[PDB]
Amino acid sequence: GSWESKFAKESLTFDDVLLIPAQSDILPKDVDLSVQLSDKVKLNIPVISAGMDTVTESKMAIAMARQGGLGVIHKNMGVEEQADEVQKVKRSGGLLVAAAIGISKDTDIRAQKLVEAGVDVLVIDTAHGHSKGVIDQVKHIKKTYPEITLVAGNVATAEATKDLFEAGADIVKVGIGPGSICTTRVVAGVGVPQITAIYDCATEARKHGKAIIADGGIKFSGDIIKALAAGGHAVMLGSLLAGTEESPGATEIFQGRQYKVYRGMGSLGAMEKFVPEGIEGRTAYKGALQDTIYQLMGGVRAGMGYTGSHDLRELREEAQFTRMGP
Amino acid sequence: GSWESKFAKESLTFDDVLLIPAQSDILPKDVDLSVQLSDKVKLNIPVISAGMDTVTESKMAIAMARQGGLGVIHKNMGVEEQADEVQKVKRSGGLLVAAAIGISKDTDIRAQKLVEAGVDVLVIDTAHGHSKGVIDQVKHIKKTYPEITLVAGNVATAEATKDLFEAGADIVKVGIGPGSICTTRVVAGVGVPQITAIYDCATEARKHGKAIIADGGIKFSGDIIKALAAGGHAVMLGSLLAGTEESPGATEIFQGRQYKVYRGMGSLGAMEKFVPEGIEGRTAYKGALQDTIYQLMGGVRAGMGYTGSHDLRELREEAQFTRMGP
Amino acid sequence: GSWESKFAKESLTFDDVLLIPAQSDILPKDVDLSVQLSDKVKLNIPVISAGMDTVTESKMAIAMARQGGLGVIHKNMGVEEQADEVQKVKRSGGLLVAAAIGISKDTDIRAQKLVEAGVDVLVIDTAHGHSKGVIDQVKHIKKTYPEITLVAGNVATAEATKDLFEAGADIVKVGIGPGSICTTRVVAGVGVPQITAIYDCATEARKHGKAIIADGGIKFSGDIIKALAAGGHAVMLGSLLAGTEESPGATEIFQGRQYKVYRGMGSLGAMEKFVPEGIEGRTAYKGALQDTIYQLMGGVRAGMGYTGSHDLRELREEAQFTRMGP
Amino acid sequence: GSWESKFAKESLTFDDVLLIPAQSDILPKDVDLSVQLSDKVKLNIPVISAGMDTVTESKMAIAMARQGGLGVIHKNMGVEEQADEVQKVKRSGGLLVAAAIGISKDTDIRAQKLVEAGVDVLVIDTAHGHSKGVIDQVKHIKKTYPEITLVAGNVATAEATKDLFEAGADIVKVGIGPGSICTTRVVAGVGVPQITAIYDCATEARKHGKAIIADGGIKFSGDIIKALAAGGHAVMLGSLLAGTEESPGATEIFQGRQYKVYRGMGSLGAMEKFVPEGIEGRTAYKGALQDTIYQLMGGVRAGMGYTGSHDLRELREEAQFTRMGP
Ligand SMILES: C[C@H](Nc1ccc2ncc3c(c2c1)CCOC3)C(=O)Nc1ccc(Cl)nc1
Ligand SMILES: C[C@H](Nc1ccc2ncc3c(c2c1)CCOC3)C(=O)Nc1ccc(Cl)nc1
Ligand SMILES: C[C@H](Nc1ccc2ncc3c(c2c1)CCOC3)C(=O)Nc1ccc(Cl)nc1
Ligand SMILES: C[C@H](Nc1ccc2ncc3c(c2c1)CCOC3)C(=O)Nc1ccc(Cl)nc1
Ligand SMILES: O=c1[nH]cnc2c1ncn2[C@@H]1O[C@H](COP(=O)(O)O)[C@@H](O)[C@H]1O
Ligand SMILES: O=c1[nH]cnc2c1ncn2[C@@H]1O[C@H](COP(=O)(O)O)[C@@H](O)[C@H]1O
Ligand SMILES: O=c1[nH]cnc2c1ncn2[C@@H]1O[C@H](COP(=O)(O)O)[C@@H](O)[C@H]1O
Ligand SMILES: O=c1[nH]cnc2c1ncn2[C@@H]1O[C@H](COP(=O)(O)O)[C@@H](O)[C@H]1O
């Protein structure tokens, strides 16, 4: 019964687990960081910059794509402005570009202009992916544009992952409540500790032979490899990339120290009705994206050498974790 | 044996659990927040202001009732003064009003005057509801006034909930030691982590077809929905409402910042013999109650949309939680 | 095998548990706080002041005994001086008095002089009670003085409790590493979380029909009732009593605030070779012992009313706990 | 399946466990602290100073050996300079000396010069011992120099311990991520909580009849005895010894207080490509090594008396632990 099972489930977060070292014949410099997200999308590094207004526009998307990654242009701008940002990326050496779409009335014209601008991947980006409004949008976007790779989310269960893959999504984005700037857990009382969310969703994805994006809660390079080893094909970063020069924000000074503004897409300012589910704050200026990425991938490479993971397929399928206390 | 089972039980609090997101066809704006506490009592929002001297008098009770909620007038005043506070609420558009009663000698005349003043619900409010003094009072008040909805508490077990429902209570109030200002755990060594207390008591309540009030420990809107999803029909708030203008306290200033006094009904000052089980302190001035309630219900609505809970019956009966570590 | 079972055991401390409230017909004022520690020793309150140099001498022992408790005169003084301290207590209205004895050469003459001074209970007080030196001393002291109540400790297992009771002890004192000023856990890597230590030792004591003293780690009145409900007949306090006027220390002033010195009997200063296992520090001046005791017993009474424990026998045998997280 | 077992393993650290006190006929002064690491290597105390540049050179190695211990001369210097440091130790009364070797090209000439200088034990010191590069080096060094005691590591599993012992190692060094200055867990996402790592590796070592070194994470004397009781034959210290006069660092002054530099062998400065896995910081000046060791062994002796461990064989094989919460 539903009553009896209320408190049955146990979930894990990044800080609850560590990768166990294993037999390795491969050096960190020699590991393969590439991942196939779909038939058309192949990334050299498993990192995607977040579809947020304090994180990704053309400057971030170009820089990300030049590192072998990908950037999701945020939808908190006009249809034309978004298509123009997509154009800048494509005109920068035919770089892979992703763009965010919602469920609202404006989606129909937005998706056409983005596809027209030469977008590679469309991202149905919502707070609650396990909904009718989102399922219908997935069916619609996939019927209208079958050549464009479709990402749909956010979800945190196997049932939600099943339903999105069945509706027509190519990639499912996982994460409900783990984000650094997220207040959903405290406001709505809802969330799935991210390691369990990734694992439960990837368990389902493995059946469909499809990819998942581990979105939110990544604090360091160690969280990146843990997110991939739990089942994620690629990770999505907000906090770790917001402080870089390439993020759309303006560099500010406060008591000598250089800072950049980072906020939730559900914060008061970003929403400009729904009660806020995100915060707005300050994050230290990081410098060039390229240097942030190099440090992050260095740590991921170190971990793949420790686990004897020659590639990401060997990490996702074979790497073992140990649970531990605080 | 009693000896062998000493440490058998495991209990959970709000911070130990989160609601798992589920299939949803309903938007937060569209969810139904109403709850039937008894045949005569129907609330538009599942919130009740606490029967405390730094929380509820006529000003709080009117404001609460105008939001679709309910206020429990505290019993730390004279019989006539209490009846007059009840009168003010009833004379304010026939608003639903609740009033607190004890077990002491003065209860007999107090209950008559409150009923005379047009009270809708009587609350036998004690520290230890699983007692002979309380069982007898429930039988007495229900025989004398069968038309008035009777709330009895506080309890934290199924056995206590059974005994109150059998004695004649319509609603059982759950909470032993979780209150923000409570020191019972540290003083008396007694308590039941509130999520388990609600669930164990609601498991019993479901058999009798009766309602339970989740009383104490609520820090944010996320704790409200967790308390309801664990089995509570409505929640009781102290701390979250004490800082509002409508609370009986006087607005004070200390080093520029505006504060309001909030104290336990078992603190030294409130008791004015029993050793203190509550603290007296300062809480930031919140402003209008109406705005505090709107933010709180906004978060509860967000959570009901995440879980696909069209109403509170679907939340209490079907919503699933995950346990997690610190 | 010993190898396979290395990490089998799980242990609990005070902060891991709470008493579950139960059916109660008794009020806190009406509960019985008396306990029979032996055929000759009957205490009105289950509290014993610690056999420490910053805690108990004649002034503490008299004050303790006048509250219905007991004081253990420390052995960090001359034989004659100790006997004189015992005399002062006996000459103060025939008050019950306890005195500490070791295992060293001086024990033989010390025990005779203390018995001569009219001591009621002798305490073989050691860091490691589960030893040959201690077993032999128990046999010796019990053969030589069969009319004097013998306490032996400290221990933290059933096997140790069995061996002391079999050697001739009347009461076994439980506690290895829980003391507020103790550093044994960090220095020696040894300890048994105190709730489990009490329960495991009391499980053994129940077979012999004998009493146990829950010694160390008590921070508040809630820890007192938890220690008794876990199986302890009486508790021993260091930290909670050291700040009182009756403790042998001198009242000092530091930056306006009044303090008293409290130290481990295994600290550098107290030892005046063994590496230190205790710390020396400052504790706030508490005032009169009588007031400290009244507050503490008030909390214990509150808890006995919550659990429906009319007496300590009903607490120790029937009271149930719940485990919980941080 | 590998997928299903991803989160099966549970691991423990020092802070998760305590030694249970047991029947003891031995006093701390009387316990035997000696350990046989190999046929040729016998230590009077189970302590080895770390093969680090802010910890061990000739001055540390001589002082360690004079306490009955051992020092591993670090390999972050020239071949001749290392052999000269080894010479100074041997010329200081034929004291036991250990020296670090890697897997790199320079290893072949380095190992010859160290053996020529009269080294007793060679240490193949790596970040990831469960590798082909390390297995091959073990086979090579053991074939070329069968008279010199070979230590190989670092590892954290039974499989890794098996493979090193089979390749020709005499002693396996255990520790992946527990070091005070280590950032591997946060950078690479890899680690095995040290108590479990020691126990899992020693379970394997017991089959081969060989010794293991518990390396890293030791904060106090309590962690030393816990590391040995979990299966370690001897411990390796970095942090605890870095502040002593005998460490190669220079004594510095900062705001009155005396400090010494302590850094990871994977920190930026020490590496002078791999991303850093260690930090560089300041540690308080401790004084003479001899005094640090005396305090540490005093605590280990206290613990062996509590557990009735007459020797280290009785500790490793019979001592029992209890798990506990935070
Ligand atoms: C106001 C709030 N705004 C956002 C915006 C962007 C987000 N982006 C990612 C994530 C979340 C986000 C929340 C929350 C869950 O974690 C991932 C939001 O839309 N609330 C909401 C609540 C319930 C339902 Cl049914 N629909 C929507
Ligand atoms: C002094 C103390 N005062 C209060 C007052 C209001 C309360 N209101 C709610 C709650 C508690 C309260 C305690 C404590 C448990 O959590 C809920 C109280 O009456 N102690 C008490 C102890 C044992 C028994 Cl048999 N009877 C009464
Ligand atoms: C130096 C240290 N001094 C004390 C003094 C008083 C104590 N009083 C109570 C307790 C402890 C105490 C330790 C430690 C355990 O918790 C209770 C002590 O004697 N160490 C010790 C170690 C091993 C063995 Cl075989 N024998 C003795
Ligand atoms: C840069 C990093 N430097 C060090 C240096 C000394 C160490 N010494 C002891 C330990 C560790 C150490 C790491 C890390 C694990 O804990 C014990 C290192 O070499 N990374 C590394 C990563 C993966 C692989 Cl396949 N190979 C090497
Ligand atoms: O306001 C918000 N509430 C909750 N989650 C958010 C909000 N805005 C963005 N997110 C999520 O948080 C992620 C970033 O997480 P981070 O990398 O930990 O900062 C984004 O990629 C979104 O999925
Ligand atoms: O002094 C007291 N001791 C213990 N609980 C108290 C005391 N006074 C009130 N309470 C409870 O605490 C609740 C308020 O909890 P809060 O909303 O967390 O502040 C009240 O509704 C009472 O049930
Ligand atoms: O130096 C010491 N090391 C360890 N335990 C000690 C020491 N001195 C006294 N104790 C114990 O600590 C108890 C006091 O604990 P407290 O009430 O938590 O301060 C005493 O009654 C002794 O059993
Ligand atoms: O940079 C590094 N990263 C990780 N571990 C390190 C590093 N340098 C040394 N170690 C390990 O840390 C141990 C010292 O640990 P400690 O005694 O806790 O400071 C050394 O003996 C090495 O095994």
mmCIF file of C-alpha atoms in Angstrom, chain D residues 8 20 25 49 51 76 78-79 81 92 98 138 161 167 174 176 219 242 245 282 295 304 311:
data_model
loop_
_atom_site.group_PDB
_atom_site.id
_atom_site.type_symbol
_atom_site.label_atom_id
_atom_site.label_comp_id
_atom_site.label_asym_id
_atom_site.label_seq_id
_atom_site.Cartn_x
_atom_site.Cartn_y
_atom_site.Cartn_z
ATOM 1 C CA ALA D 8 26.601 -1.837 -2.331
ATOM 2 C CA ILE D 20 36.002 -1.691 23.156
ATOM 3 C CA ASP D 25 46.355 -8.273 33.186
ATOM 4 C CA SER D 49 57.742 8.923 9.104
ATOM 5 C CA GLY D 51 58.387 9.892 2.412
ATOM 6 C CA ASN D 76 62.117 14.764 -4.472
ATOM 7 C CA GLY D 78 68.882 14.089 -6.835
ATOM 8 C CA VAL D 79 69.993 10.404 -6.855
ATOM 9 C CA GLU D 81 71.752 13.622 -2.626
ATOM 10 C CA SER D 92 74.802 7.218 12.658
ATOM 11 C CA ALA D 98 64.106 3.392 4.216
ATOM 12 C CA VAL D 138 57.803 -4.556 -8.062
ATOM 13 C CA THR D 161 47.064 -5.980 -2.035
ATOM 14 C CA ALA D 167 54.397 -9.343 -7.887
ATOM 15 C CA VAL D 174 47.507 1.252 2.436
ATOM 16 C CA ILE D 176 43.944 6.252 -1.057
ATOM 17 C CA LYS D 219 45.330 12.939 13.688
ATOM 18 C CA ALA D 242 55.941 17.852 10.038
ATOM 19 C CA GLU D 245 62.498 20.397 14.563
ATOM 20 C CA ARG D 282 51.237 26.038 7.883
ATOM 21 C CA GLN D 295 53.234 11.401 23.817
ATOM 22 C CA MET D 304 46.669 -1.476 24.721
ATOM 23 C CA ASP D 311 51.509 -7.018 22.175
#
